[PDB]
Amino acid sequence: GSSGSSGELPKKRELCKFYITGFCARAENCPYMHGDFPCKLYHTTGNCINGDDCMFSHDPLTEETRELLDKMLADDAEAGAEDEKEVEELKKSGPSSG
Ligand SMILES: [Zn+2]
Ligand SMILES: [Zn+2]
Protein backbone atom coordinates (compact mmCIF):
# COMPACT_ATOMS: atom_id res chain seq x y z
CA GLY A 1 0.00 0.00 0.00
CA SER A 2 1.31 3.40 -1.06
CA SER A 3 -1.70 5.57 -1.89
CA GLY A 4 -3.83 4.81 1.15
CA SER A 5 -6.34 7.48 0.16
CA SER A 6 -9.80 6.38 -0.99
CA GLY A 7 -12.16 8.50 -3.06
CA GLU A 8 -15.18 9.69 -1.07
CA LEU A 9 -18.13 7.59 -2.24
CA PRO A 10 -21.36 6.13 -0.80
CA LYS A 11 -19.92 2.83 0.43
CA LYS A 12 -20.00 1.30 3.91
CA ARG A 13 -16.66 -0.24 4.90
CA GLU A 14 -18.07 -2.02 7.95
CA LEU A 15 -18.62 -5.69 8.78
CA CYS A 16 -22.14 -6.46 7.55
CA LYS A 17 -24.38 -7.52 10.44
CA PHE A 18 -25.49 -10.38 8.21
CA TYR A 19 -22.29 -11.60 6.55
CA ILE A 20 -21.26 -12.66 10.06
CA THR A 21 -23.56 -15.65 9.58
CA GLY A 22 -23.80 -15.74 5.80
CA PHE A 23 -27.50 -14.95 5.44
CA CYS A 24 -27.42 -11.58 3.68
CA ALA A 25 -30.41 -10.85 1.44
CA ARG A 26 -28.36 -8.43 -0.67
CA ALA A 27 -25.26 -10.21 -1.98
CA GLU A 28 -23.60 -7.93 -4.53
CA ASN A 29 -25.92 -5.13 -3.41
CA CYS A 30 -24.46 -5.11 0.10
CA PRO A 31 -22.91 -1.66 0.74
CA TYR A 32 -20.92 -3.32 3.52
CA MET A 33 -17.76 -5.45 3.53
CA HIS A 34 -17.85 -9.25 3.30
CA GLY A 35 -14.64 -10.97 2.23
CA ASP A 36 -12.14 -8.15 1.81
CA PHE A 37 -12.85 -7.30 5.45
CA PRO A 38 -9.92 -8.48 7.61
CA CYS A 39 -10.44 -11.30 10.11
CA LYS A 40 -10.82 -10.35 13.77
CA LEU A 41 -9.49 -13.41 15.61
CA TYR A 42 -6.52 -13.72 13.25
CA HIS A 43 -5.63 -10.34 14.75
CA THR A 44 -6.98 -10.52 18.30
CA THR A 45 -4.12 -12.94 18.97
CA GLY A 46 -2.59 -13.63 15.57
CA ASN A 47 -3.84 -17.12 14.72
CA CYS A 48 -7.33 -17.96 13.47
CA ILE A 49 -9.20 -21.02 14.72
CA ASN A 50 -10.77 -21.57 11.30
CA GLY A 51 -7.42 -21.93 9.55
CA ASP A 52 -6.45 -21.45 5.91
CA ASP A 53 -10.07 -22.07 4.94
CA CYS A 54 -11.47 -19.08 6.84
CA MET A 55 -14.57 -17.28 5.57
CA PHE A 56 -12.78 -13.99 6.24
CA SER A 57 -9.78 -12.41 4.52
CA HIS A 58 -6.34 -12.80 6.11
CA ASP A 59 -4.65 -9.96 4.23
CA PRO A 60 -2.13 -7.62 5.89
CA LEU A 61 -3.86 -4.74 7.67
CA THR A 62 -3.59 -1.39 5.88
CA GLU A 63 -3.68 2.26 6.94
CA GLU A 64 -7.27 2.09 5.71
CA THR A 65 -8.69 -1.21 6.99
CA ARG A 66 -6.83 -0.62 10.25
CA GLU A 67 -9.24 2.25 10.93
CA LEU A 68 -12.13 -0.20 10.58
CA LEU A 69 -11.11 -2.49 13.45
CA ASP A 70 -10.63 0.51 15.73
CA LYS A 71 -14.33 1.22 15.20
CA MET A 72 -15.72 -2.31 14.89
CA LEU A 73 -14.04 -3.38 18.13
CA ALA A 74 -14.70 -0.15 20.03
CA ASP A 75 -18.37 -0.59 19.14
CA ASP A 76 -18.63 -4.24 20.18
CA ALA A 77 -16.18 -4.16 23.09
CA GLU A 78 -17.80 -1.07 24.60
CA ALA A 79 -21.31 -2.38 23.94
CA GLY A 80 -21.26 -5.80 25.58
CA ALA A 81 -24.24 -7.96 26.51
CA GLU A 82 -24.47 -10.59 29.25
CA ASP A 83 -24.92 -14.24 28.25
CA GLU A 84 -25.53 -17.29 30.44
CA LYS A 85 -22.75 -19.87 30.71
CA GLU A 86 -21.85 -23.14 32.43
CA VAL A 87 -19.68 -26.27 32.31
CA GLU A 88 -21.40 -29.06 30.39
CA GLU A 89 -21.35 -32.43 32.15
CA LEU A 90 -18.66 -34.80 30.88
CA LYS A 91 -20.56 -37.93 31.89
CA LYS A 92 -23.44 -38.23 34.36
CA SER A 93 -24.00 -41.43 36.33
CA GLY A 94 -26.28 -43.94 34.63
CA PRO A 95 -28.45 -46.89 35.74
CA SER A 96 -27.97 -50.55 34.81
CA SER A 97 -29.76 -52.86 32.38
CA GLY A 98 -30.09 -56.64 32.36
ZN1 LIG B 1 -24.23 -8.12 3.66
ZN1 LIG C 1 -9.95 -15.99 10.16
Residue 12 C-alpha to ligand 1 middle, in angstroms? 10
Cα 29 from Cα 98, distance rounded (Å)? 63
Cα 84 from Cα 86, distance rounded (Å)? 7
State which approach was used to obtain the coordinates.
Answer: NMR
Cα 17 from Cα 9, distance rounded (Å)? 21
Residue 28 C-alpha to ligand 1 middle, in angstroms? 8
Residue 21 C-alpha to ligand 1 middle, in angstroms? 10
Of the bound ligands, which one is closest to the alpha carbon of residue 39? 2
Rg (CA), the chain: 20
Q: Concatenated DSSP letters for 56-98? A: SB-----HHHHHHHHHHHHHHHHS----------S--------
